[PDB]
Amino acid sequence: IPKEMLRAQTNFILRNVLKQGDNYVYGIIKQVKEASNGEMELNEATLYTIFKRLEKDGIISSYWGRKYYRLTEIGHENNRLAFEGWSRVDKIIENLEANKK
Amino acid sequence: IPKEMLRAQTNFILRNVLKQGDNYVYGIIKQVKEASNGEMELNEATLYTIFKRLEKDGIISSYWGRKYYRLTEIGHENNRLAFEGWSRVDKIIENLEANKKSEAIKSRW
């Protein structure tokens, strides 16, 4: 149940949200609550902190509309490599199980 | 380049590797290199850090022949909970895309 694994799962979900296009912090929370049948309510302050860190890192930018955030060009590449990485993970997991079988 | 996400991907692989049975560090590198057609070589240091954390927390124990690692009873439970969590993530993402595709069809019309 380690906190580094819960955080990786939460990062993966945020990555998929920002993949869709521009969003704002309360809209993200709304979307994840509905898509998780209520299981998962992201804390708004935590979300701002993560985003401030991503913004400082050039991964994310923002503009006023409500503040909206969107992936930068560096952010979109970081995301593509992250999803490509998970696809290879998925494929490696299949071959390891076929190899055992 | 997502560095914390690389570590989660390496952790995810290792969990499934240990699920298949006991192993040693370099045998794991071999098996995953074979299972990826040579594309992917796990960094040995990332591997050790994970195993040093898993060993300290009782998820894995080890034995000498070369050091081998095995999932403990606690490890199998931790593992099952990790896969439940990753499975719920997969469904949340599907629900996020079905909901966005729904909003978009209703917005064309």
Author numbering:
A (entry chain A): 4 to 68, 76 to 111
B (entry chain B): 4 to 68, 76 to 119
Direct quotes from the study:
Our group previously produced a promiscuous designer enzyme by incorporating the noncanonical amino acid para-aminophenylalanine at position valine-15 of the Lactococcal multidrug resistance regulatory (LmrR) protein scaffold. In doing so, we enabled the formation of iminium ion intermediates formed by the condensation of aldehydes with the amino moiety of the pAF catalytic residue, thus mimicking known reactivities of small molecule organocatalysts in a protein scaffold. Assessment of the Michaelis–Menten kinetic parameters of these evolved mutants revealed that the mutations that improved one catalytic activity caused a concomitant decrease in the other, i.e., directed evolution produced catalytic specialization. We successfully obtained crystals for both the RGN and RMH mutants, with one crystal diffracting to a maximum resolution of 2.45 Å for the former mutant and two crystals diffracting at 2.55 and 2.24 Å for the latter.
Comparing the structure of LmrR_pAF16 with the RGN mutant reveals an unexpected change in the quaternary structure. With only three mutations, the assembly of the monomers to form the homodimeric structure is markedly different, as seen in 3D-structural alignments. This is also reflected in a closing of the hydrophobic pocket formed at the dimer interface, where the distance between the two closest atoms of the W96/W96′ side chains decreases from 6.3 Å in LmrR_pAF to 4.0 Å in the RGN mutant. Accordingly, the pocket volume of the RGN mutant (∼800 Å3), as estimated using PyVOL,21 is around half that of LmrR_pAF (∼1600 Å3). The newly installed R18 side chain forms hydrogen bonds with carbonyl moieties in the N88 and N89 side chains (the latter was also introduced in directed evolution). In one monomer, the H-bonding partner of R18 is E7′ rather than N88/N89; this interaction also likely affects the dimer assembly and hence the pocket volume. These new interactions may “pin” together the α1 and α4 helices and thus provide the large increase in angle, from 51.5° and 52.7° for each monomer LmrR_pAF to 54.5° and 60.1° for each monomer in the RGN mutant, which in turn allows tighter packing of the two monomers to form the homodimer affording the resulting smaller pocket volume. We also observed an increase in proximity between α1 and α4′ helices (i.e., between two monomers forming the homodimer), which may be caused by increased space afforded for the Q12 side chain by the S95G mutant in RGN, allowing for closer packing of these helixes and gives a decreased distance between the α-carbons of these residues by almost 1 Å compared to LmrR_pAF. Strikingly, in the RGN variant the 2-methyl-indole substrate remained in the pocket for five of the six replicates, with a clear bias toward dihedral angles indicative of the formation of the experimentally verified (S)-enantiomer upon close approaches.
